Amino acid sequence: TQLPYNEKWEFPRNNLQFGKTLGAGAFGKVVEATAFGLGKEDAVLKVAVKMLKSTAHADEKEALMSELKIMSHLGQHENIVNLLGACTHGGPVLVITEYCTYGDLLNFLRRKAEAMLGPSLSGRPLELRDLLHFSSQVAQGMAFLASKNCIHRDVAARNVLLTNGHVAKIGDFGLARDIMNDSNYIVKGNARLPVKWMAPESIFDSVYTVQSDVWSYGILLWEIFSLGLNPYPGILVNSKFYKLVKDGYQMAQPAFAPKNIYSIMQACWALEPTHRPTFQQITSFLQEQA
Numbered sequence: 001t002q003l004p005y006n007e008k009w010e011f012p013r014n015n016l017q018f019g020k021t022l023g024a025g026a027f028g029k030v031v032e033a034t035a036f037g038l039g040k041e042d043a044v045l046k047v048a049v050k051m052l053k054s055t056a057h058a059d060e061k062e063a064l065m066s067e068l069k070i071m072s073h074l075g076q077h078e079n080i081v082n083l084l085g086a087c088t089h090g091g092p093v094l095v096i097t098e099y100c101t102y103g104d105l106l107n108f109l110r111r112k113a114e115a116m117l118g119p120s121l122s123g124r125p126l127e128l129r130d131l132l133h134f135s136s137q138v139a140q141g142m143a144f145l146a147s148k149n150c151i152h153r154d155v156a157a158r159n160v161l162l163t164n165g166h167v168a169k170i171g172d173f174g175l176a177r178d179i180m181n182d183s184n185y186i187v188k189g190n191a192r193l194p195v196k197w198m199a200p201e202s203i204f205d206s207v208y209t210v211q212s213d214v215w216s217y218g219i220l221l222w223e224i225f226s227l228g229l230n231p232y233p234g235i236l237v238n239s240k241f242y243k244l245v246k247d248g249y250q251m252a253q254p255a256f257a258p259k260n261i262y263s264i265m266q267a268c269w270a271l272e273p274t275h276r277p278t279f280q281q282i283t284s285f286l287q288e289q290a
């Protein structure tokens with residue numbers, strides 16, 4: 001965008017020691033690293049570093065810079081993936097963020113479920129309160145983005161990261177996601193879209209607002225209280241699916257959701273955008289439950 005990059009984030013690329021890859025897309029990837037003398041307190045930290053692959057070209061580079069500019073503009077919040085620094089001089093653009101010990105929320109829930117079933121068939125197990133905290137925290141992060149007039153457009157469990165103390169943060173893999181081979185992204189003409197997460201006005205009118213994010217959050221809520229099931233499971237995205245969503249078809253109550261939380265999901269799925277709850281409403285409600 002036309003936003004400026006502030007060099008207050010500038011970090012020496014030689015002060016990074018790279019480790020394993022945390023995720024990889026077609027033209028970008030995220031790599032774990034250690035930063036030496038990062039931040040006000042000169043900390044020595046494990047961080048995440050987004051960068052372009054050798055396959056990337058000019059457009060991919062302009063996108064990575066825009067993402068960096070946006071993250072600066074956003075500010076910092078406990079429930080988003082915070083920008084820690086950047087390397088824009090003397091080499092490829094490097095974007096440095098917080099490292100989240102437990103990875104994405106979706107995989108975490110799935111592995112946790114398997115580990116809990118283990119004793120019967122094959123750290124501590126999840127309780128309902130953990131799910132409420134996760135949901136509450138993601139809502140706080142989304143409410144923060146909404147207060148900045150910032151539209152996420154891909155709210156989902158795969159884009160939520162869990163850090164120390166199991167605190168959920170909302171992020172965006174962007175170039176570091178392999179959408180080309182991801183079955184959660186459907187080929188809708190020009191682009192590949194997370195259709196099962198999208199609001200009807202987004203699907204049909206290409207309209208993205210804070211409210212269409214609220215819809216997608218409802219789908220996320222479903223993911224959490226089913227412990228990481230695919231939305232609309234078994235249902236092929238086609239003309240019938242599109243028409244169904246448009247006529248108010250909604251998923252059934254997840255196995256682990258209290259009627260309370262499922263009512264919240266349904267509210268998020270109001271066909272009329274302005275009838276859906278705000279992120280601050282969702283936040284206040286969930287905080288009390290948790």
Ligand SMILES: Cc1ccc(NC(=O)c2ccc(CN3CCN(C)CC3)cc2)cc1Nc1nccc(-c2cccnc2)n1
Pocket residue numbers: 022023030048049050067070071081095096097098099100101102103104150151152153161170171172173176
């Ligand atoms: C390294 C990096 C660089 C950038 C980002 N970006 C964001 O987190 C983000 C969040 C919100 C926005 C807002 N944006 C507004 C416009 N719309 C269209 C998109 C959203 C942009 C970027 C995250 C990361 N971090 C990241 N990415 C993937 C995986 C991991 C990761 C994995 C495991 C452990 N620790 C970290 N970490």
